[PDB]
Design an enzyme around this catalytic site. Structure first.
Site, PDB file in Angstrom:
ATOM      1  N   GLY A  54      14.534 -14.674  -5.226  1.00 17.03           N
ATOM      2  CA  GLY A  54      13.936 -14.291  -3.963  1.00 17.03           C
ATOM      3  C   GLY A  54      14.214 -12.841  -3.650  1.00 17.03           C
ATOM      4  N   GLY A  65      14.518 -10.223  -0.156  1.00 18.86           N
ATOM      5  CA  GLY A  65      14.574 -10.017   1.271  1.00 18.86           C
ATOM      6  C   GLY A  65      14.562  -8.537   1.616  1.00 18.86           C
ATOM      7  N   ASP A 100      26.744 -15.754  11.059  1.00 16.38           N
ATOM      8  CA  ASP A 100      25.361 -15.870  10.610  1.00 16.38           C
ATOM      9  C   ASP A 100      25.030 -17.299  10.200  1.00 16.38           C
ATOM     10  OD1 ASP A 100      22.841 -14.883  10.293  1.00 16.38           O
ATOM     11  OD2 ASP A 100      23.207 -13.905   8.362  1.00 16.38           O
TER      12      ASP A 100
END
Ligand SMILES: CC(C)c1cnn2c(NCc3ccccc3)cc(NC[C@@H]3CCNC[C@H]3O)nc12
Lengths: 279, 286, 65
Positions: free
Chosen positions: B10, B12, B113
């Site tokens: 992935g 980001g 988070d």
């Protein structure tokens, strides 16, 4: 926490002999690499140690007048970074003047002391072009320093253990009526303790306790019962003996420390500049 | 170095992740501060429910971090309609998250988070806290933090009211939200702004008073709100037993000090009651 | 297969640290700065700072390399 930290596991060494062996190995490895690559221009291990002490003092001075005000934890982290780096590296390869600034930079990053790079290099007593060049050198050596620390960036300093011991003395040791009277003097000892290799040989708690008890000793106050009664070391006699031996060795380390000499550091700085200009 | 790239996992805004050989590699300011944060924190922590930093390297100012490879995360589990979340599965996820958080808090570090996509699962069903780019040490008086931490949907009301000084509650509240997202399969409080987040929290759980939160109005960003009665917890979670409702209430207490810690949550009857948590190898996979 | 809590058993190599909730009763909190109402509202108490300081003071005091 220290008791399961990388500092305790990897960067606390059994004896000064081990540290001397590591530094001699670094010096000999640089000599072998230079011989294979490329004389009395080489630095001796004791000369390297003298220059490392001088540039640790320089790093202390740089962190002292750093604006914005540098937290003492950041300064301790940077000094420990410097010591760890030059345990396994020679000053003839990587110049201590740039390495110490890289240590301060990385310590500022790690201890979450948000300072921008331009205002980091504005603290340098150099011309703006010199400041830009120093910033470029620091950015070049940041990853090198991190690699040479083996990616162990959290440094446990003795200041918080010192505060905890002061709280414990204020609460559980009324015999010492005002433990705060021990602070200043003990802090002084702490600084002197930082000048030696004790940070690579003893736990931060042991260093803080040694500083406090040495301050008490210069105050004429015996807190042996604090170790015996409050810390429950009357139950473990061997633990008390080991702790007292650790403190005595730490005091011996402080008493055997010798400051670098100005003529010696001048000659060694000339030799180091010759080493970096050559090769 | 010694890692053969296998797949692209992935990308980001902050980093790019690759499956390499099995590990996952994550790629004038110098080395980026979030990567340094992750390195410095994960090198001092070792727990089965915390992601392990296996290695790190790089060149120049860029840096890559090596982690254990994870099969999925809790967000994929929640958003997968085919997966059925039994109370045993929910208890297992909550137990693993809370054990990791108890280890983290015991070492004086806040994740800051916590959310379903930051709770990663491996092929053995072991949940681990990940994405320590926002994690920070707590317990220092002089150290003041920002209140814009945690994703808004999982942000605690004290953070939304501008708390600079805080503790484990900012994680526990997020944990509660995660628990709610496990029970409802949708975000509990999906606000689109800080004001909307606070309004949703108060319309769901009731507007807090001085009794519930003694120093509420002392927070610099406190906003007066229309008195809401709040929906009773058993109405929101109609399938939740009394023990689970007690856990939820403890996790959603407005007073952060009164909010249950990870250890207290682990000691609650919900986790020791029947049924037992589903074993990690038996947890569902998407 | 029922879960049962057990506190983390991590050796600190130092004197035992008093429990967080008993810091006030034992008199420790009289020697740390009191948290402001804003800090209390955020969930920060002086007990946290005192507990962290004591834990750091006692960690690894008895450890030998
Ligand atoms: C610890 C980190 C570096 C890690 C380990 N495995 N893994 C995988 N594996 C594939 C995957 C696919 C779907 C759901 C979860 C994981 C994907 C991934 N994606 C990057 C983001 C990191 C923060 N959380 C969300 C995640 O997408 N980050 C990671």
């Amino acid at each position: 926490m220290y008791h399961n930290s990388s500092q305790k596991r990897h960067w606390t060494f059994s004896s000064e002999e081990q540290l001397a062996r590591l530094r001699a190995d670094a010096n000999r490895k640089f000599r072998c690499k230079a011989v294979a690559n490329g004389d009395p221009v080489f630095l001796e291990p004791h000369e390297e140690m003298t220059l490392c002490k001088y540039y640790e003092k320089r790093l202390l001075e740089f962190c002292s007048v750093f604006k914005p005000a540098m937290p003492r934890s950041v300064v301790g982290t940077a000094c420990m970074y410097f010591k760890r780096f030059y345990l396994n590296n020679s000053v003839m390869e990587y110049h201590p003047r740039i390495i110490m600034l890289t240590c301060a930079f990385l310590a500022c990053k790690v201890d979450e002391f948000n300072v921008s790079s331009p205002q980091f290099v504005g603290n340098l007593r150099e011309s703006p072009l010199g400041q830009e060049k120093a910033l470029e050198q620091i950015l070049e050596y940041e990853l090198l320093l991190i690699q040479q620390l083996n990616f162990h960036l959290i440094v446990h300093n003795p200041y918080r253990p010192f505060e905890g011991f002061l709280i414990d003395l204020k609460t559980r040791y009324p015999i010492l009526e005002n433990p705060e009277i021990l602070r200043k003097t003990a802090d002084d000892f702490l600084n002197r303790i930082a000048l030696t290799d004790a940070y690579l040989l003893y736990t931060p708690s042991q260093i803080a306790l040694t500083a406090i008890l040495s301050s008490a000793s210069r105050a004429g106050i015996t807190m042996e019962s604090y170790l015996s009664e409050s810390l429950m070391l009357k139950e473990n006699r061997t633990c008390l003996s080991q702790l007292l031996d650790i403190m005595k060795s730490m005091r011996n380390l402080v008493k055997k420390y010798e400051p670098p000499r100005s003529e010696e550091v001048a000659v060694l700085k000339q030799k180091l500049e010759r080493c970096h200009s050559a090769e | 170095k010694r890692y053969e790239k296998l797949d692209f996992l992935g990308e980001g805004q902050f980093a790019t992740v690759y499956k390499a050989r099995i590990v996952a590699i994550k790629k004038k300011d110098g080395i980026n501060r979030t990567a340094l944060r992750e390195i410095k924190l994960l090198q001092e922590l070792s727990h089965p429910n915390i992601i392990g930093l296996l290695d790190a390297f790089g060149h120049k100012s860029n840096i890559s971090l090596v982690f254990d490879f994870m099969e999925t995360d809790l967000e994929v589990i929640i958003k997968d309609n085919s997966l059925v979340l039994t109370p045993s599965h929910i208890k297992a996820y909550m137990l693993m998250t809370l054990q990791g958080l108890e280890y983290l808090h015991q070492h004086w570090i806040l994740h800051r988070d916590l959310k379903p996509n930051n709770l990663l699962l491996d092929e053995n069903g072991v949940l681990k806290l990940a994405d320590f780019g926002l994690a920070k040490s707590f317990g220092s008086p002089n150290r003041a933090y920002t209140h814009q931490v945690v994703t808004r949907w999982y942000r605690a009301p004290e953070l939304l009211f501008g708390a600079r000084m805080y503790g484990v509650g900012v994680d526990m509240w997020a944990v509660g939200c995660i628990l709610a997202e496990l029970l409802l399969r949708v975000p509990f409080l999906p606000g689109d702004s800080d004001l909307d987040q606070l309004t949703r929290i108060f319309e769901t759980l009731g507007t807090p008073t001085e009794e519930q939160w003694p120093d509420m109005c002392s927070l610099p960003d406190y906003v007066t709100f229309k008195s809401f009665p709040g929906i009773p917890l058993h109405h929101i979670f109609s399938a939740a037993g009394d023990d689970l409702l007690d856990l939820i209430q403890g996790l959603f207490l407005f007073n952060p000090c009164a909010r249950i810690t990870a250890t207290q949550a682990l000691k609650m009857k919900y986790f020791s009651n029947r049924p037992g948590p589903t074993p990690g190898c038996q947890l569902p996979r998407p | 297969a029922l879960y049962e809590y057990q506190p983390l058993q991590i050796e600190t190599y130092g004197p035992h640290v008093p429990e967080l909730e008993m810091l006030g009763r034992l008199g420790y909190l009289n020697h740390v700065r009191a948290a402001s109402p804003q800090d209390l509202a955020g969930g920060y108490t002086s007990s946290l700072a005192c507990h962290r300081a004591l834990q750091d003071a006692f960690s690894g005091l008895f450890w030998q390399p």
